[PDB]
Design a binder for this molecule. Structure first.
Ligand SMILES: [Mg+2]
Lengths: 39, 148, 25, 108, 156, 59, 140, 73, 94, 97
């Protein structure tokens, strides 16, 4: 269920829109930023 | 199907990620014909990019037998002893380059079914669950329907 | 196919029955 | 005080919240078993095989545990001891045994 | 407002009360301070984490193996730092939480080893009495990863 | 825990008896719990091919 | 005959290599082996959704069994987990319930506390605390 | 109705789309109201300028935010 | 014991299908959404008489572009480089 | 050594003797065995849990089919906990100083 999140402003699907999709997944160890994916 | 082909597990050959990473590929025996219209890609590869491919990783030895044949083949041996022989019959230079790069990136494991893509050696940390978990102990462990 | 007026009541459509059941007094 | 779960079995969880508001911290120490919730282990020291005339008579009698039966009563005894069905104690055909993976892969 | 104690007067569930909010916040502060002290004094070992990598939530622990279904455009032998940490904790204490944890809290280090595709799968369609039959062989690329160690900083 | 392999497996996969008393009790609610505990719908290691059936003694 | 078939046995072997573990005459009769292999491949292709549904139902059953053993239910647990801003799928929950019981008990306690706070806020129509562990984080 | 849906640019389901507020599009929406969902669009701040183009978001409940970040408050 | 006549969905004597609670809740929520749509579609802006030709220029430009793209259909160019480098099939170690 | 058990590479004979020797080296009296939990004592598949108590304090616990193997497993767990080579130990740091 994801209807409760519709009243707060985070849509209903956690796999899209939020800090779990637009945030880069992996990165380098020295500190270089990873290139964003084409999606 | 999976019930007709054998399977294996996902594991390392000798723990490469823990200590240090070593090159799994060893030798690359190429068989390029002298005359023919079926090994043009292999000929152009050996002409232009085999030097760069040999200088990219010093742990891979490239053998060019140059035997007059009809179907150009390549032999790739790994540390575990697996020998995967594929044919580059009528292929471009980019295709052969991608193929040899994929062969150098992979190891000697079989290309069969993966069977459980995740593998861990220490699965239990906070104690493996048992049927006696989440059950409080009574006084002196007295079983029910007793007198003492 | 039956006519519009018959004697055996003739059960209505599923959507019509749902609409009549959701719009009761 | 208040407790969401009874702190008398398995583990003792203690809920908490960080004052920052971006993470949840919980401290749950392990719970052991007290001494008043255990029973002494019985020691069945049965000895009814020695006498006065001989000494190796008990060693001779120790080799007297042998019993032979057919198939029906044997399967019935196995089913009544292991609480299983009698259908699993029958042999299987060779077609269902030659295709058996004698060397299956092992994990961990 | 007074009602006699019958069978349907009182609810079946026990009436649960809530403690003082100030005392609850004080207890939470004491607990997180004790956790920070136990972390800074070194009393943990063999920790696991739930890293949301490639839209797949794995049980990233010490010395493990994971497999994805694509590539990473990286060479074999480079260290990979994984983010998106939502749950972590060794023994006797765990950390969670709101979408993610902090970037300076958990530092997961991974390393790519093997880059192989997959077994030749078969996708076949068929229909009865219609002369319909399709067949393909899909070989998707994959990437084998291995997480070295997971560090934790006592900056709560 | 720090257990080995065979003792750990024997402690994990093991048959556990249960006692379900009757007397002024509906048979449906008792049979439901009995079948749930026989099939294994009360343990996280539930599986159809694992054969994790327990024992229920209803008196 | 001119340029007739000279490599038909290779096609027969290519078709029969997928029928080397069947019972009856299906592993020898090519006319039946073709249909058998066709149906086998069709079912193997169509059973992906069935496998996914079976795995999901198994995970749900494991989570429900763990919640019943701890002292809660499955719908209430799912609701309290989705109302606490924590995104954990069924696989990691089952893995924790099977291997790491301490964190699962902590999650169950957090879920029970969140459910109690929600019931208190519903009965009070809240005003002032509205739950200590609540307070959603705003991401702009 | 299929033609109206295809002309309004609503091929896939659960896909947002913005039209005008004129009697023509009003009638086109009243035709397929039993197939789609009508929701207004409000702007909390101003219109996205030329520099605020690659940094935008639709958000929920129809709130076209001009500055979308990945950091909490 | 009770037998149903020919096809329990078509014909005269059919097996009646009834309504439960999920269908009622779905109909209620759909009617609420449709009433909200009716409310939001009860207010214009230009009142028809203020849009005699505001975006006709864009439509005309798009139509002209589509016409120019549809009337510019021609076979691709033919070069000699392909016919010359096709001779490299029988290339030796040169 | 990753994932391998300690005594699988040691292969001892009498864990109780070495355990009581280490306890005497740690100024401890003598351990005694107590039956914690049990399930099925008359069936063909028995299960027992023996907990070693030292001065009214539990130190470890070991399962088993009978009582002898359970006490042996408990002694092995106690000896592995006294040596610090358990499953919750610090993993080897494969890095450079
Ligand atoms: Mg009929």
């Amino acid at each position: 269920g994801g209807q409760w999140r519709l009243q707060q402003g985070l849509a209903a699907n956690p796999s899209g829109y939020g800090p779990l999709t637009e945030l880069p997944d992996w990165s380098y160890a020295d500190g270089r930023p990873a290139p964003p994916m084409k999606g | 199907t999976a019930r007709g082909t054998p399977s294996r597990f996902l594991a390392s050959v000798l723990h490469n990620g823990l200590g240090r990473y070593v090159q799994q590929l060893q030798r690359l025996s190429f068989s390029v014909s002298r005359d023919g219209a079926s090994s043009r890609g292999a000929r152009e590869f050996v002409e232009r990019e085999v030097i760069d491919f040999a200088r990219r990783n010093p742990g891979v030895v490239i053998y060019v037998n140059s035997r007059p044949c009809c179907v150009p083949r390549v032999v790739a041996e790994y540390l575990n002893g697996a020998v995967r022989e594929e044919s580059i019959h009528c292929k471009s230079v980019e295709e052969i380059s991608t193929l040899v790069q994929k062969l150098a990136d992979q190891s000697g494991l079989d290309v069969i079914r993966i069977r459980k893509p995740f593998h861990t050696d220490n699965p239990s940390i906070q104690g493996q669950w048992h049927p006696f978990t989440n059950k409080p102990t009574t006084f002196r462990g007295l079983r029910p329907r007793e007198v003492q | 196919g039956s006519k519009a007026v018959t004697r055996h009541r003739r059960v209505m459509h599923f959507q019509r029955q749902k609409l009549m059941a959701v719009t009761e007094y | 005080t208040y407790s969401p779960l009874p702190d008398d079995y398995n583990c003792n969880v203690e809920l908490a919240l960080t004052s920052d508001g971006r993470t949840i911290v919980c401290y749950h120490p392990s719970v052991d078993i007290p001494y008043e919730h255990t029973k002494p282990i019985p020691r069945p020291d049965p000895v009814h095989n020695n006498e006065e005339t001989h000494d190796q008579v008990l060693k001779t009698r120790l080799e007297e545990k042998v019993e032979h039966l057919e198939e029906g009563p044997m399967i019935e005894q196995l089913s009544k001891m292991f609480f299983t069905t009698k259908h699993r104690w029958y042999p299987h055909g060779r077609y269902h045994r030659c295709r058996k993976n004698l060397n299956p892969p092992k994990d961990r | 407002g007074y009602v006699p104690k019958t069978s349907l007067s009182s609810p079946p569930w026990p009436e649960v009360v809530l403690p003082d909010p100030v005392e609850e916040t004080r207890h939470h502060a004491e607990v997180v301070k004790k956790v920070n002290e136990m972390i800074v004094t070194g009393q943990y070992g063999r920790l696991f984490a739930v890293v949301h990598f490639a839209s797949r939530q794995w049980k990233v622990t010490s010395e493990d193996l994971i497999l994805i279904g694509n590539e990473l455009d990286l060479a074999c032998g480079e260290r990979i730092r994984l983010e998106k940490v939502l749950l972590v904790g060794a023994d006797n204490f765990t950390l969670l939480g709101k979408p993610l944890l902090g970037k300076d809290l958990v530092r997961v280090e991974a390393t790519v080893i093997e880059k192989t595709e997959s077994w030749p799968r078969i996708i076949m369609r068929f229909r009865k009495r219609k002369n319909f039959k399709k067949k393909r062989i899909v070989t998707t690329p994959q990437t084998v990863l291995r997480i070295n160690s997971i560090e934790i900083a006592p900056c709560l | 825990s720090s257990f080995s392999r065979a003792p750990q497996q024997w402690a994990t996969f093991a048959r556990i008896w249960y006692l379900l008393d009757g007397k002024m009790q509906p048979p449906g609610k008792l049979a439901a719990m009995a079948s749930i505990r026989l099939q294994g719908l009360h343990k996280p290691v539930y599986h159809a091919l694992s054969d994790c059936g327990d024992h229920v003694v209803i008196m | 005959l001119r340029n007739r078939v000279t490599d038909r046995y290779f096609r027969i072997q290519e078709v029969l290599k997928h029928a080397r573990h069947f019972r009856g005459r299906k592993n020898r009769c090519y006319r039946l082996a073709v249909r058998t292999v066709i149906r086998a491949f069709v079912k193997c292709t169509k059973a992906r959704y069935l496998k996914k549904k079976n795995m999901r139902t198994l995970w749900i059953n494991r989570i429900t069994a763990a919640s019943q053993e701890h002292g809660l239910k499955y719908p209430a647990l799912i609701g309290n987990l989705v109302k606490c801003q924590v995104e954990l799928n069924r696989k990691v929950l089952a893995d924790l319930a099977i291997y790491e019981p301490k964190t699962f008990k902590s999650l169950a306690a957090l879920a029970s506390r969140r459910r109690h706070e929600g019931f208190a806020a519903a009965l009070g129509d809240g005003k002032e605390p509205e739950g200590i562990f609540s307070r959603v984080v705003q991401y702009h | 109705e299929k033609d109206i849906i295809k002309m309004l640019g609503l091929e896939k389901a659960h896909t947002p789309q913005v039209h005008k507020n004129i009697p023509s599009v009003n009638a086109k929406l009243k035709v397929v109201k039993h197939l789609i969902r009508i929701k207004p669009l409000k702007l909390p701040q101003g219109l996205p300028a030329e520099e605020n183009m690659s940094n935008t978001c639709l958000k929920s409940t129809g709130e076209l935010v001009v500055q979308w970040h990945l950091k909490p408050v | 014991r009770g037998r149903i006549p020919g096809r329990q969905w078509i014909g005269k004597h059919r097996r009646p299908r009834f309504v439960s609670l999920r269908a009622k809740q779905n109909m209620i929520r759909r009617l609420e959404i449709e009433a909200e749509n009716h409310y939001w579609l009860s207010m214009p802006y230009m009142t028809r008489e203020q849009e005699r030709g505001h975006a006709a220029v864009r439509r005309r430009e798009a139509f002209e572009a589509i016409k120019a793209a549809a009337t510019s259909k021609f076979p691709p160019h033919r070069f000699i480089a392909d016919q010359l480098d096709h001779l490299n099939v029988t290339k030796k170690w040169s | 050594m990753t994932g391998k058990e300690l005594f699988e590479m040691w292969k001892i004979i009498n864990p109780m003797g070495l355990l009581v020797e280490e306890l005497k080296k740690r100024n401890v009296s003598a351990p005694e065995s107590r039956l914690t939990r049990q399930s099925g004592g008359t069936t063909a598949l028995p299960l027992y849990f023996v907990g070693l108590y030292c001065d009214k304090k539990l130190i470890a616990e070991g399962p088993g089919e009978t009582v002898l193997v359970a006490e042996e497993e408990a002694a092995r767990v106690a000896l592995r906990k006294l040596y610090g080579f358990t499953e919750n130990r610090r993993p080897w740091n494969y890095s450079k100083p």
